[PDB]
Design a protein around this ligand. Sequence first.
Ligand SMILES: Cc1cc2nc3c(=O)[nH]c(=O)nc-3n(C[C@H](O)[C@H](O)[C@H](O)COP(=O)(O)O)c2cc1C
Lengths: 830, 246
Amino acid sequence: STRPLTLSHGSLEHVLLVPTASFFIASQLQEQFNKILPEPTEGFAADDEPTTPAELVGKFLGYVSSLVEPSKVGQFDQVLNLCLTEFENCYLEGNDIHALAAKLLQENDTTLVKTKELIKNYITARIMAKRPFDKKSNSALFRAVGEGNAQLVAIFGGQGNTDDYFEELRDLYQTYHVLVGDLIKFSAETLSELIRTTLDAEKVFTQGLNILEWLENPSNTPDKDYLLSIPISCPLIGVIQLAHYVVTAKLLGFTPGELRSYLKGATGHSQGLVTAVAIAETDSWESFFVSVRKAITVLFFIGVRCYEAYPNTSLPPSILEDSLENNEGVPSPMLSISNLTQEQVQDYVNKTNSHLPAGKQVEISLVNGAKNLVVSGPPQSLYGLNLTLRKAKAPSGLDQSRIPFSERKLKFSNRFLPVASPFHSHLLVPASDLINKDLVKNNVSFNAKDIQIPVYDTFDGSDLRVLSGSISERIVDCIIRLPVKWETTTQFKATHILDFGPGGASGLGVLTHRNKDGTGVRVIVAGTLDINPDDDYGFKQEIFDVTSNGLKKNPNWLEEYHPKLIKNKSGKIFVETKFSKLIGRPPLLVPGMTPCTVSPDFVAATTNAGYTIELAGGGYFSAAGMTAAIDSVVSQIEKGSTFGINLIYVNPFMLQWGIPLIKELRSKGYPIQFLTIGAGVPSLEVASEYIETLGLKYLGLKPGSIDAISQVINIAKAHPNFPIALQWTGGRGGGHHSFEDAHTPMLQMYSKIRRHPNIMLIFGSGFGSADDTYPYLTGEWSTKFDYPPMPFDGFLFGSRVMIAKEVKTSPDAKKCIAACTGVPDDKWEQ
Amino acid sequence: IFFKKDSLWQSEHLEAVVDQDVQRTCILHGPVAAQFTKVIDEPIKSIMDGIHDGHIKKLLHQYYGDDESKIPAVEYFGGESPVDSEDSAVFKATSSTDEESWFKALAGSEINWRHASFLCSFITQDKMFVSNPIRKVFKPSQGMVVEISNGNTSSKTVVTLSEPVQGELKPTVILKLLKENIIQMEMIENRTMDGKPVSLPLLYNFNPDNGFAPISEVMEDRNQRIKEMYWKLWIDEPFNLDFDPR
Ligand SMILES: Cc1cc2nc3c(=O)[nH]c(=O)nc-3n(C[C@H](O)[C@H](O)[C@H](O)COP(=O)(O)O)c2cc1C
């Protein structure tokens, strides 16, 4: 016995079958919410108004839950439980709210602010209804971890990720108040206690540290220049991370020990490392805050003592002017050098340190990646370095494509970090000893036995537990002065990583992802709910997703593109790559060459040798002269053989008859398997025409540089089911050659190419044996460059084949080609 | 323009150069790939097979402990796009049944004459590449039922499609195997003068050594076989094509 009760926001409505027993109070709260709900606007663009029936119901739940007091059993509670259970079984199809919120963002015209307003409403409604998440969630990720199919590691971001970081803490307070608002006030009172506890804290906290006051009332919130000041910022980022951990534990419905047991290890970047060891030691909900008070204490002291040793000083307004008027950061005690190796930067900082005295010398603080360093020191000295770096860099808007690869001007970026302390520099050394007297004061020490999962040190990469000496001494030594060797510490084998630190999608999660792209390991930003468009790293939803969309694995290149072998019925052994699978012939091809592969007799011989060769159009001028050539190939080849055609893009007259001719031969059905476009990559419209009109099997393209490769990738994306041979060649190739290095453009694009399954990535140039080609089939050729292996689907041979029997090169030419000594890959650019 | 135009053909035809002197001519060649061009007139097949084997031998050593047996066998290796088991099966084609899904269901999982004959988008008429008629015929629509007999044993497998012939439903297509490498798409006509249906053998050779397009249509006396069929339907004489048109 249930009467219908309908609630609407203009055109969109929801209905709940309210039992006639509880209909009066429900229908009373119906007109109440309907007069709270503002008038419907066209597009529902304005804030504080639902766009979807999920968001409407959410607002209703939130409005009801506001009127509910959890202490007193009211007549609002039974209708709350009825409309909450109605939402759940109508919208949450078993899945977590975060996944639904993600589908709303992906599908509907809902803004991210509306989604955060829906999720806080649902969580609020769930808490006042007296329905905690006591049940252990069926989150695909953790299900796979429990079954042993996955391994998790939890990383913790540090300082300088973002400047506007407080708006993360605000967002967590506003959204998940009912979950973390106990931790936030506990941290607040812990800081307040540590201020008047410490002798000289009240001195540095000029505008206080009443965090709860600034969270509750945004107007009161001080300027960001006070907020980035380390004594405040350090522990507060600490609180942000712990709040992200709790949110995770609560939504999953685990204890902080249970979640810690799911993890196979955890580590942090700089002052995230402290959160890691605090999270490593937590066991129950009750003994959670003993670990938190430890973390808060240590983060407060390092922040106070570092600031007291080296506080930020008045900077000359001329220097601030000069850095701003060159599109560079405001000076700060850390500078990020992207796209330069450790040795280059070490040289330039050695040059800088030469002139400067010992007290102001700058040193490399963080080694984030191979080509991503952060140097720390006095912001005046770091400016004095920034000047040296601005000499070497060419303008960002300079075309070096026509210059030989090694004569180009090395181009990089250098931007000042949003941080207010020289971490991992000799400047913070004096503080070291002071922090240990304060750490022993509060008796905030970590025991090896208390730590259950391994925590990795930031300097040497080794486990924290194994340290025979004081763990608190070493973790302080690491954060303040010891440099971070990030790729040393992150060398653990793990199927998934969880980024908790600040930064959202700008923080530590995405930096690790870039620094181990293609080793299979997935990175999930556990901080913020969002949609990654490339889906090359996950967001919160993927932790709490219960469908197969949870346990998404990132491609591992070595294993997904592992070169195989296969045998035919006849018992002939083929090399089995992406390419060979399609063509059903060995994954080698001889590419169109004028005038060597213009001879129909050569093309025919090579085809009948059980390999793939392209009829070069370059030696042909008329539809007739090419047609007579092809029909001389067709006569000679075996029945059900095929051969390709190599049309040059830059010769428009060649294309204007060549393209229609092929179209006529394919509409009649000649054995033209594929078309290569040499010297140039066609426009998206012209390439589309060639695909969808000439009725080939696949299409070969020969990109000359990065811009070409990008254009190829676009064309492949535009035709996902049509196979596209990418015939990459370096500048070291025979014939018409570009200036590009053979290797570097593939290091810089292998990732972006392989994300499109229809690109059949063929390496070419400088190949004539198996020994020199093996490492590019295996993938190991990238190991010399410090990358994961990058296997290639096939190989083209251009020069090697020109001294064959069947090529019409004159014997004395063949003798002259032989007599050439040749030079290895390092020398060719002479 | 005079100096530079048409500057390549000379090396191939040293007879049409001033002294038959190659040192005048322009020969395109890669500096790096010049380290391996040392043996002249080496046969095209000798070089290519020599590179491929040089690959196979290494892969076998590194990933199979030099044991050839460990290599996975197939019917034929080819015609697999780089986008990505029951014996006596039945399939009922609607107006809405998917094209790909329908063909994957017909073919089955195991790589065999069926797999080729239902997924090979092309076939080879002589040297020519004509669109696959077997994917045209088993394009799904109302009425047709597809029975598969011995479906888990390729060699004996026989697919029968049946359609509604005058309200009642009779077999139209019997695609089966003759001698090992011969596919008979026995196309049957029931609507005849005497009720005795006329069977058109659309023979096709099956070469697994051509992984790309292993299905070729038989064209020798293929006109004669369509003639024999149209001699049964139309003519009521005994079949003979040795009569002068004149
Ligand atoms: C004589 C000669 C002619 C060539 N002609 C063409 C051509 O017409 N079109 C084209 O795209 N590439 C042409 N190339 C480049 C090859 O297709 C291939 O990209 C290159 O030879 C591979 O480098 P390698 O020669 O060092 O092996 C030619 C190369 C040579 C040596």
